[PDB]
Task: structure prediction
Amino acid sequence: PVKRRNAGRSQKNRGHTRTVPCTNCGRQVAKDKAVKRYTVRDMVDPSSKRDIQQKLAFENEKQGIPKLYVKLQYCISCAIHSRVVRVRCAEDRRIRRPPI
Amino acid sequence: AAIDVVNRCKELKINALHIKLRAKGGVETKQPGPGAQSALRALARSGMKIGRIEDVTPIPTDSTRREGGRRGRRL
RNA sequence: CAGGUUGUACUUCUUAGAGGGACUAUUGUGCAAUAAGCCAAUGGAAGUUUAAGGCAAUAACAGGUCUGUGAUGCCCCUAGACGUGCUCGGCCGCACGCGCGUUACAAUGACUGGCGCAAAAAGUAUUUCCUGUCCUGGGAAGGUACGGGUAAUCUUAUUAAUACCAGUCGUGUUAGGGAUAGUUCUUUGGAAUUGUGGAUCUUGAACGAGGAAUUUCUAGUAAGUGCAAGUCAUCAGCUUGCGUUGAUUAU
RNA sequence: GAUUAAUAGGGACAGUUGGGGGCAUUAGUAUUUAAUAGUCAGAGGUGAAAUUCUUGGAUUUAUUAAGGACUAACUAAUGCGAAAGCAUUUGCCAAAGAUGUUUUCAUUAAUCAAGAACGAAAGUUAGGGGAUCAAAGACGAUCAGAUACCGUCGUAGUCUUAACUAUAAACUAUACCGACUCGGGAUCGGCUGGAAUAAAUGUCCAGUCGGCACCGUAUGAGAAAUCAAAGUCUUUGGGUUCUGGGGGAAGUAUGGUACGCAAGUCUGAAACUUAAAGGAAUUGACGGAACAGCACACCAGAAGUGGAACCUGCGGCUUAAUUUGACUCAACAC
Ligand SMILES: [Mg+2]
Ligand SMILES: [Mg+2]
Ligand SMILES: [Mg+2]
Ligand SMILES: [Mg+2]
Ligand SMILES: [Mg+2]
Ligand SMILES: [Mg+2]
Ligand SMILES: [Mg+2]
Ligand SMILES: [Mg+2]
Ligand SMILES: [Mg+2]
Ligand SMILES: [Mg+2]
Ligand SMILES: [Mg+2]
Ligand SMILES: [Mg+2]
Ligand SMILES: [Mg+2]
Ligand SMILES: [Mg+2]
Ligand SMILES: [Mg+2]
Ligand SMILES: [Mg+2]
Ligand SMILES: [Mg+2]
Ligand SMILES: [Mg+2]
Ligand SMILES: [Mg+2]
Ligand SMILES: [Mg+2]
Ligand SMILES: [Mg+2]
Ligand SMILES: [Zn+2]
Result:
């Protein structure tokens, strides 16, 4: 019973692909296989934002607080446990560009 | 922590701090800890002006090998 | 203010038959993708499916019941019987373990007076069943003196107890609390001893609000408070119901 | 007197294309360490913690330097390589496909016992090197026990010269050359026209050859999962190597003028025993997985039982007998 046709990794036309340590655990995982999400968040709770934006010395800031950039790479056990990715029915299992 | 710092800058006559934020970085995690936000807030909460803000977290062009196993932390 | 009478009288109260009544009604630039529906305010006796119940598909669980059955298969006992009786015990026997529960640890209390507040149930194959007057006894209780009722007629449309009003008692194993005991008296029963219940003096223990745990519960509801019915000759700390006083907190 | 010139194959050549290879170069932060400055009491680490480090000043901050690795992000259902594998700059060296040819050769080809070139990791031999991690080991913790999962350390290893070794789920678990059978966009590399502009190593459009794939679909296949091959198979034959014949025994025994220093590799049995082992899929049940309902389950509360005396059931224990049924809700004031 082949489960995935992909077999989980996006790799074709090559023998080998570089291994990446998982953010959460650090387990080595295939770069194709890895659940990778790029995150641009803000360093600060919106309330905290109000508080700081009061005290910003340079008024020449328009959204003058930096965002936090993360390239987040999960091994499978981790990204499942941690709900980044979750179990779906056989038909949905092949759906490719899902979010909102 | 923050309020102690602020109280002590206040007598050094210091209005404003630039901020350089860091997580352990390098080969370790790049997500700053829980205290990050709280300390940043409590600093300004204490009536301290805030200057330019940068994240300097150590960022390998490339890494030495991670402290985990080959299989990472199990459990 | 109370009785007694009364009528081609009357229906508010009381029976209880017919028929109404509620359909989530009306309104809502309330939420609903404007659909089902939810929500609020108003009206309304009633808007939690009005409230509380009765009934309970398909499938199970070798759940329980040969001790409810003159429903039984099979097995067993069959005359000093495992049949049908009689007499005395026993099931209530106590080092202890575990469940339902009644009563308390008090002042929002206990006790002494006073006080025309219920509901729902029962009831005589004639003296036997509810029992009303009356009388005796200090009392539980006894007479039998006069009586009613197979009951909407008589017990009774009362007789309940929390509650209320006075007064005592004064934060202490105290009258809180009454377990346990010893005399007496009464009642049901041939039979009360291994106290059936009830009465009088005594006697007065634990308990100073409860470890780990854990039950039930959203409105006339919880909780307190008595009353009936089943059992029953006698025996309610049980059950099944009935009202009274009435919440805290969530929809 | 020399057949064509295979949408056969070899060769030439032309502009490209590539994270293919080998040498040199070269960068970049990062880990670790050191130096020089600072400042102070805690750093680490965990579920909590403890081993550790710390006033001889750690962690922390700034600037440099040393030393081994490693090439992030861009990074993809994209590329190259025979596979293993391959990702910093530049230069050099040889090599390659596809495309483009009104070039040349003219069957030179397909597959393949022998025999050969490669071949992750781990491991072995002789030197180097040693920053990070890190088998073994030393410790902390956890636990009934942990010689485990976690933590602090740490050797071999990890890197490198010369050599061995030949093995992996070395995986599309799918042999190679060749035909033929559906549709659709997109993608990487050539080419051919066309169009726009700010006129180009850039766009767009339409062709086409070759790649990696994908999405539909089959009145094709299959036990199915699924498969554009896993189709053109009882309507059974295009060419060629390899492998299997119930399960264990067992990749064991044994033999190897087969290999290896060794580990081991390759070759490789039978006796014996056994009725199934096995493949996909369905429905249940279960889950120390994900989601969603509902109930006084919780929410917010109340009255409390559990503590006391007594009453009344169970169980024990005595008994001549203490008749008996009924033990989680779903026995036990029944
Ligand atoms: Mg591989
Ligand atoms: Mg760690
Ligand atoms: Mg109903
Ligand atoms: Mg049974
Ligand atoms: Mg009398
Ligand atoms: Mg009566
Ligand atoms: Mg006596
Ligand atoms: Mg008594
Ligand atoms: Mg009676
Ligand atoms: Mg009873
Ligand atoms: Mg350096
Ligand atoms: Mg270097
Ligand atoms: Mg590329
Ligand atoms: Mg060596
Ligand atoms: Mg222990
Ligand atoms: Mg270490
Ligand atoms: Mg062109
Ligand atoms: Mg078919
Ligand atoms: Mg076949
Ligand atoms: Mg397909
Ligand atoms: Mg054939
Ligand atoms: Zn992980």
